[PDB]
Ligand SMILES: O=Cc1ccc(-c2cn([C@@H]3O[C@H](COP(=O)(O)OP(=O)(O)O[C@H]4O[C@H](CO)[C@H](O)[C@H](O)[C@H]4O)[C@@H](O)[C@H]3O)c(=O)[nH]c2=O)s1
Ligand SMILES: O=Cc1ccc(-c2cn([C@@H]3O[C@H](COP(=O)(O)OP(=O)(O)O[C@H]4O[C@H](CO)[C@H](O)[C@H](O)[C@H]4O)[C@@H](O)[C@H]3O)c(=O)[nH]c2=O)s1
Ligand SMILES: [Mn+2]
């Protein structure tokens with residue numbers, strides 16, 4: 067139940083974006099700049115006291131990415147909302163000291179030096195259900211450069227991989243061997259989602275990561291490994307279980323490889339040179 | 341968990357509609373022809389064994405509208421899904437004999453000759469919670485002329501009133517007297533929703549109808565009646581509790597008064613001369 071708010075009236079006969087698809091054929095929004103009024107969304111999610119968990123793995127050399135990842139998350143990720151970072155690492159002492167805004171906390175979870183799926187679904191199942199409302203699972207070799215907020219939150223979301231958003235499904239690098247659980251035939255597929263940014267309600271993310279982990283274990287027992295590992299299985303899952311929002315490539319970009327095309331009004335979350 | 345399906349690939353750089361707004365600023369889809377693949381939606385809702393209740397009031401002379409309303413609903417409303425019609429009338433014997441498709445049933449609920457809100461929220465509360473998953477509440481002086489299906493289903497939806505979809509908020513006929521619970525100031529409002537077609541999950545429709553009934557009772561005690569009765573209160577509710585889908589005027593039209601504009605690719609549910 068929202069309070070009075072003053073903002074520009076949406077106009078039915080004036081689209082927000084005419085250059086891009088803003089809704090999937092199963093009526094999930096595709097989140098692009100211009101499509102949302104973040105003041106309305108912030109109010110809706112604050113009134114539910116929403117807590118967002120962000121999971122990131124930083125094992126071996128990748129601990130070096132945490133400083134920029136976390137500092138930029140503090141500037142751009144869910145600012146104003148409750149956030150709990152979960153950093154999985156084999157080197158807890160290498161986690162940098164980053165000062166956090168109010169309502170935000172960080173937990174370091176030590177692991178031994180694809181298996182992100184198992185860690186999210188099984189080991190942390192009960193903890194996440196009790197501590198957060200949504201989970202966002204990302205790669206660490208990345209930085210936030212602009213707003214990533216509650217516009218992404220929904221029961222289940224995937225993000226368009228920046229290499230494939232303009233490609234036909236035949237060109238998608240899905241697993242194509244029928245022997246793999248991740249198999250998708252050439253005549254199937256909506257989008258190619260990136261492994262580096264997905265999420266949803268805790269319940270839906272636990273279902274996704276459990277399904278992917280089970281599928282990966284089946285492949286392992288059959289002596290096969292999907293072409294792009296967890297990303298192949300994520301794609302098979304999201305083909306069969308449609309996401310309730312799809313994030314545009316504003317949310318998963320690589321400026322070094324792909325520049326800054328006119329269709330991207332903002333570059334929000336981007337790869338860092340490894 | 342959907343089975344294999346073969347259908348045209350959505351294309352990120354090819355919008356479905358460039359002439360209209362297809363998502364609200366709070367990321368609810370606006371349902372227009374071309375935006376959805378009904379095969380995907382039908383599969384999703386059938387896999388949940390979805391049952392849709394449709395409520396309609398036909399009191400006094402308006403029983404005369406039931407024959408065309410129900411016959412056309414059989415041709416066009418949720419075909420393939422489980423449907424339960426609830427016909428509220430002061431003349432049960434005037435309800436026409438209409439042959440129903442499989443999986444569809446009709447119950448006649450006798451009432452004595454705005455108060456639709458009370459009937460939906462209070463008297464029928466327990467029955468609807470046990471019998472259906474979604475409720476759709478419509479005017480009876482109407483006929484279906486084209487598909488109205490599970491693309492509309494969502495926790496809470498309203499429909500753009502066909503008289504106002506191109507209007508600025510100042511021209512909306514909201515209640516403007518601060519003395520009424522339905523009051524909306526000239527600088528507020530997203531859309532003008534029609535009283536003749538709204539719905540949602542049973543829980544959300546019961547919340548809406550309870551809130552509107554309570555607000556109407558408060559107005560009554562204060563000696564004020566909102567300018568457009570229940571529709572004024574529906575508009576106040578949906579301003580403060582944003583719908584999770586908005587139906588385009590394809591879903592609530594009057595061809596005699598408004599013709600068949602190019603922006604309407606289908607006229608789905610339309611007024612009948614009274
Ligand atoms: O022997 C060389 C190494 C290669 C990774 C390492 C490795 C990886 N990671 C963790 O793992 C994340 C992803 O790794 P990358 O970011 O190197 O590869 P890419 O960007 O191609 O990844 C995509 O494709 C992937 C397919 O499996 C996934 O679907 C992934 O989600 C997709 O985005 C790191 O950000 C980090 O959190 C570590 O924490 N330590 C490591 O040593 S070391
Ligand atoms: O003394 C003359 C009568 C006027 C209605 C009657 C009356 C009404 N109804 C039931 O009520 C429905 C709506 O009635 P209308 O369809 O005549 O009026 P309108 O189209 O302007 O209605 C809009 O504006 C309305 C605002 O309150 C609502 O928000 C409504 O949802 C809006 O769409 C009938 O379809 C029927 O189910 C009856 O069942 N019996 C009756 O005698 S008799
Ligand atoms: Mn990466």
Ligand SMILES: [Mn+2]
Pocket residue numbers: 479480481536
């Ligand atoms: Mn009417």
